């Protein structure tokens, strides 16, 4: 038989998936993030990508109904910049923040069960000791 | 600043995306493949994943309308087993076929501009010489 594997494929395909998000193409969920007194922000994304990086989004989005088009989801208790950085991680495999943001990002990462980011933010805080 | 990258992330997230396809969860496109006298087959998938692996699916799916839910797409001129193997490549980064399928798969890969698979099927046929 003939078998082939492209190792770079998942990297490349996520790169295009990130482009479609930035271009707001094929998106099926809009996250409206309102936190205390910070201004409300909005993030469009693909439920499949969010589901692939966060067990909490997967269950949030996998329900028996066939949702028709564009679902709005109200998100409480996480800052816009934290949500943004988590979304970016889901689409890029990387995340970046200043040394004083690390704590709020772990909170958000714990809240959405992004085990890779939790473990990393935990490593950082412990090393500052 | 603090920066983190998970190299395995895109692999892992595609693994979950493949699970959601096999479970027919969060799918927004059904490909109905009818070819000559072969029996008709159906494949559910996520437009975002197809778009990320095939320029032809991306343009096929990126149009000005906000499609509502589940689009059916009729696919002609490619065999069910070829379409299946291309879909599998989009979701897994790998593709497998017997030495006599390699020609029909390149046809399909050329038709959907999956440049990685075209280049590989071309390499194989030339080496059989």
UniProtKB/Swiss-Prot annotation, chains A, B:
Domain BTB: 27-99
Positions of post-translational S-(2,3-dicarboxypropyl)cysteine modification: 101
Substitution effect: residue 85 to A: Reduced formation of a high-molecular mass KEAP1 molecule when methylglyoxal accumulates
Known tissue expression: Broadly expressed, with highest levels in skeletal muscle.
Modified residue annotations for S-(2-succinyl)cysteine: 101
Subcellular location: Cytoplasm; Nucleus
Role played: Substrate-specific adapter of a BCR (BTB-CUL3-RBX1) E3 ubiquitin ligase complex that regulates the response to oxidative stress by targeting NFE2L2/NRF2 for ubiquitination. KEAP1 acts as a key sensor of oxidative and electrophilic stress: in normal conditions, the BCR(KEAP1) complex mediates ubiquitination and degradation of NFE2L2/NRF2, a transcription factor regulating expression of many cytoprotective genes.
Family (UniProt): Belongs to the KEAP1 family.
Free-text domain note: KEAP1 contains reactive cysteine residues that act as sensors for endogenously produced and exogenously encountered small molecules, which react with sulfhydryl groups and modify the cysteine sensors, leading to impair ability of the BCR(KEAP1) complex to ubiquitinate target proteins.
Name of protein: Kelch-like ECH-associated protein 1
Species of the source: Homo sapiens
Encoding gene, per UniProt annotation: KEAP1
Covered residues, full protein: 51 to 179 of 624
